[PDB]
Swiss-Prot record, chain B:
Organism: Homo sapiens
GO BP terms, alphabetized: cell-cell signaling; circadian regulation of gene expression; inflammatory response; NAD biosynthetic process; positive regulation of canonical NF-kappaB signal transduction; positive regulation of cell population proliferation; positive regulation of ERK1 and ERK2 cascade; positive regulation of gene expression
Function: Catalyzes the condensation of nicotinamide with 5-phosphoribosyl-1-pyrophosphate to yield nicotinamide mononucleotide, an intermediate in the biosynthesis of NAD. It is the rate limiting component in the mammalian NAD biosynthesis pathway. The secreted form behaves both as a cytokine with immunomodulating properties and an adipokine with anti-diabetic properties, it has no enzymatic activity, partly because of lack of activation by ATP, which has a low level in extracellular space and plasma. Plays a role in the modulation of circadian clock function.
A single MF term (Gene Ontology): identical protein binding
Family label: Belongs to the NAPRTase family.
Modified residues (Phosphotyrosine): Y170
Matching CDD domains: PBEF_like
Pathway membership: Cofactor biosynthesis; NAD(+) biosynthesis; nicotinamide D-ribonucleotide from 5-phospho-alpha-D-ribose 1-diphosphate and nicotinamide: step 1/1
Expression across tissues: Expressed in large amounts in bone marrow, liver tissue, and muscle. Also present in heart, placenta, lung, and kidney tissues.
Name of this protein: Nicotinamide phosphoribosyltransferase
Effect of L158S: In a colorectal cancer sample; somatic mutation
Residues annotated to bind beta-nicotinamide D-ribonucleotide: D201, R293, P294, D295, G335, D336, G366, R374
Amino acid sequence: EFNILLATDSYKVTHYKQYPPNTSKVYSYFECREKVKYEETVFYGLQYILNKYLKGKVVTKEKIQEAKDVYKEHFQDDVFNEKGWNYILEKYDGHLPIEIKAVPEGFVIPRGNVLFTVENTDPECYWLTNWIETILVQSWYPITVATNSREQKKILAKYLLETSGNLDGLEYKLHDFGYRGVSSQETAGIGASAHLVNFKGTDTVAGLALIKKYYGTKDPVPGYSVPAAEHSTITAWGKDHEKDAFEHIVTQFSSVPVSVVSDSYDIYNACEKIWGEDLRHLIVSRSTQAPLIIRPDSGNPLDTVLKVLEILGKKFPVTENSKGYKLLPPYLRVIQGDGVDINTLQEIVEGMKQKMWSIENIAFGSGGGLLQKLTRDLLNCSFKCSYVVTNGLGINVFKDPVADPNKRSKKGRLSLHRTPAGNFVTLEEGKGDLEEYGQDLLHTVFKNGKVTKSYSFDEIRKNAQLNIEL
Amino acid sequence: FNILLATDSYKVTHYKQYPPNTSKVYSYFECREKKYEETVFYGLQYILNKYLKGKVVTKEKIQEAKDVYKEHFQDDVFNEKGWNYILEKYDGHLPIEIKAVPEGFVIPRGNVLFTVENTDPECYWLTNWIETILVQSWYPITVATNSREQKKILAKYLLETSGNLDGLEYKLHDFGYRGVSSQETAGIGASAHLVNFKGTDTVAGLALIKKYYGTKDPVPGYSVPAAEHSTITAWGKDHEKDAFEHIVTQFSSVPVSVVSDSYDIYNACEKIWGEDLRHLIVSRSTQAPLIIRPDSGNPLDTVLKVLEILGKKFPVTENSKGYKLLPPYLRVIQGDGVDINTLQEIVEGMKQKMWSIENIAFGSGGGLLQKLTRDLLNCSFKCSYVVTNGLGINVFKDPVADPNKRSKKGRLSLHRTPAGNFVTLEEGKGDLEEYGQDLLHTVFKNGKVTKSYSFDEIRKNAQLNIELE
Ligand SMILES: NC(=O)c1cccnc1
Ligand SMILES: NC(=O)c1cccnc1
Ligand SMILES: [Cl-]
Ligand SMILES: [Cl-]
Ligand SMILES: [Cl-]
């Protein structure tokens, strides 16, 4: 079972001996520091961490002894604070004496604002606030996935609106293909759930169970998929039988959308000759609700999309929509699922617009770009101590390195408020107590071992909506 | 965990897409050739034991998967009968055979690393069901490989500036626990770094190694006391010296790392460490040095300036190679901005300024464990052989626009060449015995792990040539 005493950076085991004597409070905060610009971030994922790792009885006699034995060997010395952990076990039945206040999940907040704060509720546990930094800072990942996915939704919305005049289908425009490309099963669920804040199409099944267990949705599931081929199900037929594979697959899934990877040997031949001529009669008979979705999967992503569209536009009837953009028939669509990240997504939709193709014709799949090619440094996610009480006196604490002004941290007790113009401001040095800015938007979400406020996944999705959708 | 729900959604529909009367699907993993010329094979044994062995199918898991997929596809496409067959015939144990190169082996790109096939013809669809779970081995492979490439740089420069490799296994410390995407990732990645090094702050790696691999020693990796910004800045800006004095005094007999850049790294080194607290530093033992930690600024420029400051305040020697050496009670650790590229820049810049690599160690977090993708080594799983209507067919993909994506054909095997290198033979040609015996070993068969490696063996396998020589 998970042991929170073994879930921190090793150096944090020694910090209880390093804080100033007579310190009764350590208060810390998380922000996406100010430095695609990523001007605003979606706050998402803390509730998972609170429930899975922090709530309830998280200390036991056995976990304390386990940690003591490991740290004796790992440091080659006795430095582990057995007394302080045993105090939590005896005093609070192993429940953490910590209070966490957070902006509501799904909220979209400009960079450089407090998103959550952490402090100890018992003076003996001044060391506990930053013990749990390592666990809590991992919220950078769902925040960053949700934010990067939302920024891709903004690009798709802009170009869909310009080329088609509406946003129909926007939710299914970016599909999660990243289960194989992430570092672990646990990451797959967390990252897939973060993408589902913005979209409804996913093949990363792990995200469904996470949302069900930790957030919840009114609908039975938060994300959906369609039948689709992979190279094994095409190439297993033999190279001379690609047409037989395509025919078998489309026939098998005649009444539902079906995606068919078309680049096993020659994507351009497959489009022009196999789909275009040999099997055309099985495509033009398809329903609007069950289109054939052609999937290239190699080559330069923009050049390949444009050439596939040109081929299909010569072999199938093409209409011009009311915005002047070309539109394939409703039984035929394309999905580009190779090489897609926020930068290439932008390149593809702009190149399509230039060649007068509607964004209605295309959807995207993204794997490593969506869930793996992201780091804590993208949004400068950081956790720092801003306030301590020593000898009964509160002092404002901060770092301000000489070589990097971007690393300067906030001072004192913090609160988050709406400005007069409707923007956001973080008040420092306890100035929120003056009440000149209205109510603090941070709410207590965890106190003394209990999750005190929770959000459904439906609420999170509403909070994370685009302005354009609004 | 439910393996029925641990695959890409499209794989649920693949059983209906393969040719009728297919009795075998055989697939393989490789790090495709596209510098990262060789890869450390590591991490499959974790996956086999945690996710694939034993009774992995139950009546409840089938029902759960059926109910989820009905909603997720808005259709009934899930292969309930195929999963029930595994439950009834094999007590829920997977009828799969996996063959793999030994863990820790260092293998050039473009070679077969493992193969997967079904052992019952009814379960032809199962080989690629488990692609998604197995391909996640890219992550420990890639962490281990990139960590080993950093070890090669450190060893080259340490040998050149000092004449030996003493301390090499402590020169790159894992600072990545907070900067990875999950607790599970932290343990996997930290364990892969520990194939090459012994210093880590990512505690999760220790229990994973103990549980799935094992070591003769009580633990596979080690740490030392170290400060963070909160334990310095909590004293107040005017009391940085008091924090430093308290911390070094608290850990007088062991090595201690003290982050020194909260306000002005250069003042801290020159005035606080250099003058005010110098008496507390020059009294320390060689086994308990003060390790000064810058954490901001341009990494190379900051390291060089810190060393210049310290060389003017403390007694520097010249080692037998002609390089400058701080006294043994004083060292530096650069733990900001370190990845494989900046590590190379710093050691080369130090060498140019005549500073021994003995003076420095590195801490890497995101660069070590998170800033890596499956595309770095082109880790890829593909079907190469099927049997349909009783006839074996060699299968592959060969996309026109990308020759790099061409996959291997037929049944595969891994061999030594006459010159001692590796070669992957295709099309069953290993059976001709012109190249000796296949180097892959069966590691999983019909629900059981059949061959395994300790962490100590993996470390031996992953050693550098320079270390071996
Ligand atoms: N459904 C798909 O086409 C898919 C899913 C996951 C990875 N690659 C492709
Ligand atoms: N030990 C350290 O200095 C450390 C550990 C993890 C992250 N950053 C620094
Ligand atoms: Cl207990
Ligand atoms: Cl695929
Ligand atoms: Cl730190």
